[PDB]
Symmetry: C4
Subunit: 502 residues, 4 copies
């Protein structure tokens, strides 16, 4: 007995939503089963298409009875503890989704082909076209409201930035295949409607068996190329409208399936992405309603694609938008304050240096939203080896240096940048990660601070004497020579660490 | 007497904005009233369309006199207290919107059909085409500036994420119906302009009654199929341009309304979504201006749809965008700090565990924006039963435990995660909701903490002694074995609760 | 002498950017000047179009010499104080934009028509077509880089939410007019290229004067309808491609300008919004390059519209998006915490009540970003009359009640909502704006609090005694009966006001 | 030896990604090499196109062997210090990208033209068409997975707001050129497939050499214009479908390259931006698959453009959106509080004055994110000369005035705005930058404060006496006469500066 967030179901019920897109990608294959033999002017059956659609539907419908038996041993919880007991798992399923799952999985086209049509009354070709049209209609509803609750089951738990656009592009291909096989079947039905109407006014006499094919009967009603003209059209006799391209190309006579599939799929793709622009309909109402439905469905898909894409694109540009709004803010604040050009280009230098190092990421906000031992292991990797180069800090344990790694903040310094000047109070104690720093004094000798060296060691002796609250006056003037990365130790954060050291 | 936010008006004035879209969805039905009988070459009247458009307009125009009487008893307020007094409710309405509401509701097409046209001078068919063209023009303006203030009344108070797109898709259908009935009427007028011009140069002699279709008169000017060719076109004689499809399909002769409606609605839908691409106009100026107007209106609608959709789409992805930006921020911060792979995959584990639990929701910010008794009832449901398993906390009342439920913060812990180690100061007191926790000590024996158990009970005895400010040293090392949900009690938040307990 | 933010220039240099769109909306009118007389097979001049384009260009080019003299008395500032002195205003202008402003304003088409063409060598009709084609080419560059710095002058200072879309829709109309008059002129040039090439192989003898119209000559080369077929096309002789529609419609022969303008503007609008779909080009390279340029320009113009529209749409939905995200955050936090349905629907009631009152606006953040005297005048309008109903607060001056109006915070309460219960400590002092409140006590009698009444008067006597820090215990249980708006006075904010009262 | 962020590589490996777009913009030039001579009905070779494509490919393939030798001396780092040592630089490159970089740079079309085809068996024209079709196929894969890691190398480091749209517009031009040369080559192959099939059923007898075009042999199979009709098409014999336009225009026979390039590039641009709308395919499967691929690629390309443009557009409106939301928040907060019109238009005046000065930029947040010496140099430019007009502040050094420039905050005041009134406590000390201020007193005389003057000098003597904590009472009422910019000095920030002055 399992629960819906258990690892077996949560990896197996993603294959079920996949096999329900495979299932609706094979239901229009039964529309390619009726055929027209244009020599004898008869409606026929593509027998090998009839087998191909029946076993492709079966092999995806013995994959959803496996969903039915995996909902008899699923997990209800409450109105914190799951229910592992049957006869209430198998009573809410039988009150919520069991019949829709069993009306969607019944082999209704495969059983009407094997059982019902060879024992029906009339022509086998007309019965096959009429049963497979309506059974695929009447099973079209539970095969789509079985995917509504199974998607509500996975909105309570794939995703990438582009997955909404890739599923959108697949929805073009599925709808183009559905609309084109509908167009195939409606083209065959409009030609047989022409044949029936021409036979009910039989100036030339018509025999009604011979509209339906039968290999025992050779030859059919030969006058039907006059009353139902296709290769040269006469819309006074019959306007075929948007179905004339299917009857002129001979796709309704071919028994070659990739020939038949690709011509009709491309009709669906051409007219969905055109929003029905080039559909020259006749005055027939249901042909117009088909073209209206193609126009609306393509109108709804294209707008989704443009959106699913501008979403992919904008997902990938936030920190970069946020930098552009800050660079344009550093502009027109300078030239509203009328800053001199030596001040403005130092501002542009720091904001570009902060951008190429951090990329908009606030490191302290990123680390504070981590757990206290994971944040400790990061800051002991970054900051602890820098603190071991101060000749006093080895005297502390792994309880006070862990207070110091917690209080080290990363700072950035461009070139020409002054860290401190002689005479200023010392706020920080730096621990240099990168860059070279020239320090001078007039009290002369010029020292150099590289990676691993530390500035501000006047401040430790101030924040150890248990002393004045005014900061010690800098005896050195420290200036950066290259881009400097460092870790800053503030005065009061060092003053806290002084109280736990005696 | 009512006020505009009162419950009667605020549910009844949403039916008024609905009946004003039904009203503009039936005004182009009067354009389907003129008819052409192509045998006799006469302009006629569809009499049953003339009744259908008159009673569909009446039954939506006795639904807006109900708006007029519901503005005589509405509520003015001031330049906090509403005005319930008449003769100033019925004086600002008569200075703001009363005449536009009464110019929009006058039964001008129904009264010109029943009264004015049977007592006019000329032909009844030409008068019906000319009056219904211009009255639907001249009443088109107050039937659209009556929806401008009624929409300003409901911008001061439906909405869903997709309602802007569903109203956009309905605006296609309304504009396609308007543009297609305009195209129907302009096609009839271009054929009668051809008939008038052919009769003013009568090489073959023409009688001007017979352009207008009387059932007493049989037969008309038979030479008009020569001078106004339609079924085979000659643009030297007359170029019908974009109206030739209406005259060749026979939609201007049919009295079958769903035949006539669907052919013309589809023309409007095909050419709006094409932005007027396939309109092969003639050199006639107002035909070009009609095609320019179709092109602009379809540009405007399409751009709105694409926007209304991307809004729906983005309305559904904010917290999920915010997770992807944080994930792209965690990457390239790791590999800029060059973190080891044991540290990086622990970061990715916590940020994915925090995502699948919280989905970006900050619980403390969500609870703090709630009222103080509603926030109290939530935290007494979540946290109070967990506090009753500490063997001291039953000694408090429902005034001090309510201070403790207010200070419990939810924390998350992945697997392998250390809560505390032996030797560290104890900051928190946990109250485990989920997961198993192995605690050890070397002072050996290994205990286990499950759901309902609590960690950090060294800290209560510290924050009861009225003691040192340094936290007690942990005697245990607690480590998570599975994903742990818990509630954390900080040291100073427990130190507050100690002062109200004696 | 003026400065660029002075009120004269800043209202007058918005008419200058308007007259520079009027100027480029009249430059293609010189392309409608050449004409073809198809009877005599001659290229001619539309003389009244030649006057109309010359005075429409003049009346917008004596509107930009006014820009030249308003840049001789403009204001330079520095590399805070403007420069009001000439000879340096009129030396940077002569080094930055003076020649581009004078190359754009020279009456080069009007002066080649009046002076240069009547004193040139060759045919007056071919010289008019060739000069007006190239002078409008060679003055097309400075009439567009004169709008680049003048737009940089107004990005340093109209805007609405829809102005980017309305300017976008105007950019369709301007580009359609430019592209269609280009198509008009290129159609005339392709027919004369046919006439010249047919005359250089004169199996039928051709006289080269007679391709150019001269009203003295009557009759021209009559064989040119054979070698340059238009009304029935033969692409073996000459393929006119995308220019055949202009030569067949007779728009290149008409001297009726609104006939000629609207047919060519509609060609530009039809093919820009089609992105060049229906352009059936010939194999001519520059015809293809024209069609490639129409395709790219429409591709760029459409993408901007879709963006400009969705900016309009999203601008108007920020707080409403922010409410929908908060509503989707309240859901799945409830049903992740598994809250009972009495708790969940109270949460949905408060968040919908807060939405319909505030519409996402934080009032305290809105008021704090206002100046201190403007924020004082608002809070003395809202809160001071409510404070005058407490019978102690009239004893204070307009220095201490102004401290109380500064500390009053707006609160909201739904129905059934408990303000305080008997036994709870009293945190707030309410001042009711709206709604009715039933207060009870068991110490029984039930009082009622309406608009103007105040709750929490136990707390003033606590925060006047100079007393315990624990809050006074509520003797009443106050519960809301309707939606309550009130102003809350916190305990410590009342404790501050107590120190300035003795 | 260099590293990937070193200045030589980081400027030279942007030319490498440029020469890899030039490289894929010249691979379809080999598809323009086969030619059809329609008189003799033979497939031939364009010899000068064969040289032009070979030297344009060579001159961009001796530009990527320079990338191969610049990856033998690049910089590995670790699993902070780079590796400058060979034999491990040249062992990971030989395990990651060396063979894909050498399979992409091999001169396979140039060497099959010069070496392999003159020593092959069969016809030289059929071998040239078949080798150049498949070698450009088989080298198409490593010439595109060589740009995947080189782009991953520059996502770890151009950009502008419009660069994603300009690269998108270039991706139209590259794909249109690729698709149109594919269409050129597939048009030639469909005509030769027609010639082969007509020769395998030789009612009229066909000689198979003469399908391949040798200058020694004059004349070919002349019956092929009957069985493969092009100029008048017969789809019963052969349906050329979407390739008929190439065979009818004679672009497959022309040896004029800009004629041939522009006709085929425009076919690609017309059908990509149409998403394959106007492609009238035949029933041939791979022609349909080509048209399906054009439809999908244009569907993806267009959606990206619309997104890349709306990103540009929105990049430019983030602060201006933020002002419009704040303006829509100020409205309906006023008229929910029912503020009087003298209060509302003062609110609209300040929020518009703050907008035209600051443009949404928070100056204190902008300055605080700058380094402490750069922020000091800005505030000494803005604020120090204003502080030197107070007659006491020259007595301080450059250590205490630097504390005062750090604490000066910019304030804005509209006209009619009261700074302080007589009787109010003085919170601020202003330092006027702009505007005139009328100050009065009743203790009368009216003074004036201009730029450089300072208000609030009652407060310095309060915050120097080492005194009461209550602020001094204003003896003046100061009111603005024009828009005032000033710097504010708060009372406690002046009280800090008092402690360091004795
Ligand atoms: Ca289109
Ligand atoms: Ca089209
Ligand atoms: Ca489109």
């Amino acid at each position: 007995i399992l629960d819906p967030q258990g690892p077996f179901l949560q990896r197996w019920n993603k294959i079920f939503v996949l096999a329900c897109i495979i299932a609706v990608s094979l239901d229009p294959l039964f529309f390619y089963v009726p055929i027209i033999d244009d020599a004898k002017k008869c409606l026929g059956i593509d027998k090998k298409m009839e087998i191909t659609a029946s076993v492709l539907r079966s092999f995806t419908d013995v994959f959803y009875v496996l969903h039915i038996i995996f909902q008899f041993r699923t997990g209800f919880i409450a109105p914190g503890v799951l229910v592992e007991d049957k006869r209430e798992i198998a009573k809410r399923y039988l009150s919520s989704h069991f019949i829709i799952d069993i009306l969607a999985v019944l082999p209704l086209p495969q059983m009407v082909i094997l059982i019902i049509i060879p024992h029906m009354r009339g022509s086998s070709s007309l019965n096959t076209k009429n049963m497979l049209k309506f059974i695929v209609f009447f099973q079209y509803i539970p095969r789509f409201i079985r995917i509504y609750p199974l998607y509500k089951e996975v909105t309570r738990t794939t995703e990438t930035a582009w997955a909404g656009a890739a599923f959108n592009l697949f929805l073009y291909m599925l709808a183009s295949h559905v609309f084109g096989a509908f167009w195939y079947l409606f083209s065959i039905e409009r030609e047989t409607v022409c044949w029936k109407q021409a036979c009910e006014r039989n100036n030339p006499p018509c025999i009604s068996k011979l509209l339906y094919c039968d290999p025992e009967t050779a030859g059919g009603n030969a006058f039907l190329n006059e009353s139902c003209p296709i290769q040269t059209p006469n819309t006074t006799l019959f306007d075929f409208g948007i179905f004339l391209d299917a009857l002129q190309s001979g796709v309704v006579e071919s028994q070659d399936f990739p020939q038949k599939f690709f011509y009709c799929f491309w009709w669906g793709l051409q007219n969905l992405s055109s929003l029905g622009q080039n559909l020259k309909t006749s005055t027939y109402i249901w042909e117009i309603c088909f073209a209206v439905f193609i126009s609306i469905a393509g109108l709804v898909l294209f707008s989704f694609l443009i959106g699913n894409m501008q979403t992919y694109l904008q997902s990938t540009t936030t920190r970069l938008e946020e930098m552009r709004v800050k660079r344009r803010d550093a502009e027109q604040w300078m030239s509203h304050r009328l800053l001199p050009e030596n001040l403005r280009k130092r501002i542009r230098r720091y904001e570009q240096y902060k951008w190429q190092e951090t990329r908009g990421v606030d490191e302290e906000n990123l680390l504070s939203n981590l757990p206290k031992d994971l944040r400790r292991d990061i800051k002991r990797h970054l900051c602890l080896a820098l603190l071991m180069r101060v000749p006093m800090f080895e005297k502390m344990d792994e309880q006070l240096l862990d207070a110091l790694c917690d209080r080290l903040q990363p700072v950035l310094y461009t070139e020409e940048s002054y860290i401190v000047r002689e005479g200023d109070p010392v706020d920080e104690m730096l621990f240099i990660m990168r860059g070279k720093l020239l320090t001078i004094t007039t009290n002369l000798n010029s020292e150099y601070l590289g990676a691993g060296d530390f500035c501000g060691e006047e401040l430790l002796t101030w924040a150890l004497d248990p002393s004045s609250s005014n900061l010690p006056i800098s005896t050195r003037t420290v200036r950066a020579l290259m881009e400097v990365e460092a870790f800053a130790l503030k005065a009061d954060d060092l003053k806290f660490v002084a109280s736990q050291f005696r």
